[PDB]
Design a protein around this ligand. Structure first.
Ligand SMILES: Cc1c(C(=O)Nc2ccc(Oc3ccnc4[nH]cc(-c5ccccc5)c34)c(F)c2)c(=O)n(-c2ccc(F)cc2)n1C
Length: 276
């Protein structure tokens, strides 16, 4: 019930880390039951109305995510209701998203050059997190490197995921940009765990290229026709053939032909095991 709700008095909101359509993300402090405070990320949201049905739906979503348990899945510590202003509390991650971390590594003052072993371990972590969610039949619908967060121990965790299990007709579906959206999802208002697998392949590619924008030289508006002619992301210069084969398998036309996250995870783990 209200075991997801944290008393607002236990929260201190700090500097705004970033803003968007959904609202703002702030750095904060959460006083725990044990009397000690913890650094957190607070995401301010907008409820459609001052409705009990609206507020109950927010709490049911929060309780669902709060019950998730995986080291490669971002944890929800709880929610606050400050007109009612809903807020989501997550443990703060100083390293931020994987995408900016990859670009920073290409600069001196930024993290040291990430070796291939570390890049593959970033993928394995995402695959592990995706395996968890998709075994519970949860659909992500926003998988990209920009929505993957780095923990202090450098393990990657999946964030910004949906809490639905099936996509209903079309009355959007994939929240991520066109270049991460599966061919079937571009063609129809359709989305499965296999469409999430397509995004995983695109994310693996962003990781292997260290933050490069997918499909260089191809416009967003020409993506569906580009893929429809059988064109896929090209192999990076600094990329093992075995790794390229794994990511290419994520983009097979028929979603049924693409591997499940559990298949992918083992493929990647075996590749990592074979390297020094
Ligand atoms: C999976 C998921 C959400 C999710 O993952 N949210 C999320 C992810 C990352 C966030 O951000 C962080 C978290 C930890 N360390 C960080 N370090 C830097 C950032 C940062 C700063 C600025 C811009 C972007 C990131 C940062 C954040 F606030 C929220 C989410 O909100 N919902 C959600 C919706 C409704 C509901 F009732 C219950 C949950 N669900 C389902």
């Amino acid at each position: 019930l209200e075991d997801v709700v944290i008393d607002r008095n236990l929260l201190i909101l700090g500097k705004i880390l970033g803003e968007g359509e959904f609202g703002s993300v702030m750095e904060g402090n959460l006083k725990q039951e044990d009397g000690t405070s913890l650094k957190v990320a607070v995401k301010t949201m907008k409820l459609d109305n001052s409705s009990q049905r609206e507020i109950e739906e927010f709490l049911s979503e929060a309780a669902c995510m709060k019950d998730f348990s995986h080291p490669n899945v971002i944890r929800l510590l709880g929610v606050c209701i400050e007109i009612p202003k809903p807020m989501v509390i997550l443990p703060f991650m100083k390293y931020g998203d994987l995408h900016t971390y990859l670009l920073y590594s290409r600069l001196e003052t930024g993290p040291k050059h990430i070796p291939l072993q570390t890049l593959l371990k970033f993928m394995v972590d995402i695959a592990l997190g995706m395996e968890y969610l998709s075994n519970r039949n949860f659909l992500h619908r926003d998988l990209a490197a920009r929505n993957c967060m780095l923990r202090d121990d450098m393990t990657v965790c999946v964030a910004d995921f949906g809490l639905s299990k099936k996509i209903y007709s079309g009355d959007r579906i994939a929240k991520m940009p066109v270049k991460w959206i599966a061919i079937e999802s571009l063609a129809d208002r359709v989305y499965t765990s296999k469409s999430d697998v397509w995004a995983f392949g695109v994310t693996m590619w962003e990781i292997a290229t260290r933050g490069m924008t997918p499909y260089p030289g191809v416009q967003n508006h020409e993506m569906y026709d580009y893929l429809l002619h059988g064109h896929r992301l090209k192999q990076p210069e600094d990329c093992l053939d075995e790794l390229y084969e794994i990511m290419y398998s994520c983009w097979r036309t028929d979603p049924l032909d693409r591997p499940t996250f559990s298949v992918l995870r083992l493929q990647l783990e075996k590749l990592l095991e074979s390297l020094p």
